[PDB]
Design an enzyme around this catalytic site. Structure first.
Site, PDB file in Angstrom:
ATOM      1  N   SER A 162       0.767  -1.246   0.000  1.00  0.00           N
ATOM      2  CA  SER A 162       0.000   0.000   0.000  1.00  0.00           C
ATOM      3  C   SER A 162       0.806   1.310   0.000  1.00  0.00           C
ATOM      4  O   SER A 162       0.225   2.391  -0.088  1.00  0.00           O
ATOM      5  CB  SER A 162      -1.029  -0.003   1.137  1.00  0.00           C
ATOM      6  OG  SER A 162      -2.064  -0.936   0.867  1.00  0.00           O
TER       7      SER A 162
ATOM      8  N   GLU B 261      -4.081  -7.861  -5.601  1.00  0.00           N
ATOM      9  CA  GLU B 261      -3.027  -8.652  -6.242  1.00  0.00           C
ATOM     10  C   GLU B 261      -1.621  -8.083  -6.078  1.00  0.00           C
ATOM     11  O   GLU B 261      -0.650  -8.833  -6.009  1.00  0.00           O
ATOM     12  CB  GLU B 261      -3.312  -8.818  -7.735  1.00  0.00           C
ATOM     13  CG  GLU B 261      -4.489  -9.719  -8.064  1.00  0.00           C
ATOM     14  CD  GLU B 261      -5.823  -9.059  -7.780  1.00  0.00           C
ATOM     15  OE1 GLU B 261      -5.881  -7.805  -7.784  1.00  0.00           O
ATOM     16  OE2 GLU B 261      -6.813  -9.792  -7.560  1.00  0.00           O
TER      17      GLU B 261
END
Length: 265
Positions: A42, A142
């Protein structure tokens, strides 16, 4: 002796650790595996917002984006509650950084447009900041799930630190847009146990975390000393030896950050 201290941590946490702190006018760069590739996870969401801010007028933040229950793949603490109403670009930026919202990130990627659902454009943005190393090839979730050794969706501690430096301390963005990004990172909710935990309370810390499989745990931050001196800190780790289900170790990041803080003091 910092290399030795980082190495001990690797043994302590059965981990691979990467650290970069750019040089300042009074301090040398800190590096440990700084040029080895690590998965973004992230952490890509911070420069993603910058990319969105960069390519559009401020008025773009007020554009309402609509999506469906189908759309919100991955963790999305925010997007799930705004399906009916939609979310503005600005709201998506807020959610992507402060709550690491994967659906929000995917939508911002889409807003950049182009092949790979926006991944090519994002990667293009990094290139514009002189980062030739990093690449984003997939979306959430993913992008957290590539095998060790895969170059896809990876950056390096060195590369991401220099990007963050330009975005927050440099002139990559104009002051108004810069303030927004800074403020969202400043009010991040996901980083309490990482770099923040390694720096004493009187240091200001803004950050964006990343977490993934193969024991992946990252955090990228800008810190300010008690007298206002800024440093950029990138810390990345994974535990590939434990395979896909290996557990991320937050404490490793907090400890490494403590080591860094001791050097910067």
């Amino acid at each position: 002796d910092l290399a030795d201290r980082f190495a001990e941590l690797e043994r302590r946490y059965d981990a691979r650790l990467g650290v970069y702190v750019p040089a300042t006018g009074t301090t040398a760069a800190i590096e440990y595996r700084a040029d080895e590739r690590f998965a973004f996870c992230s952490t890509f969401k911070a420069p993603l917002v910058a990319a969105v801010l960069h390519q559009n007028p401020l008025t773009h933040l007020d554009k309402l984006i609509t999506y469906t229950s189908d759309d919100i793949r991955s963790i999305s603490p925010v997007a799930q509650q705004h399906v009916q109403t939609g979310m503005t670009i600005g709201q998506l930026c807020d959610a992507a950084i402060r709550y690491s919202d994967g659906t929000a990130a995917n939508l911002l990627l889409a807003d950049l447009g182009g092949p790979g659902g926006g991944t090519a454009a994002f990667t293009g943005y990094l290139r514009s900041l002189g980062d030739t190393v990093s690449r984003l090839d997939a979306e959430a979730p993913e992008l957290n799930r590539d095998p060790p050794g895969d170059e896809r969706d990876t950056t390096t501690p060195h590369a991401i630190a220099l990007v963050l430096q330009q975005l927050v301390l440099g002139n990559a963005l104009p002051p108004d847009k810069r303030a927004l990004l800074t403020d969202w990172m400043a009010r991040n909710t996901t980083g309490a146990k990482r770099i923040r935990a390694g720096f004493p309370a009187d240091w200001k810390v803004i950050d964006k975390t990343g977490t993934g499989d193969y024991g992946r745990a990252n955090d990228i931050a800008v810190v300010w000393s008690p007298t206002g001196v800024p440093y950029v800190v990138a810390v990345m780790s994974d535990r590939a030896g434990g395979g896909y289900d290996a557990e991320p170790r937050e404490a490793l990041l907090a400890e490494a950050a403590t080591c860094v803080a001791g050097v910067l003091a």
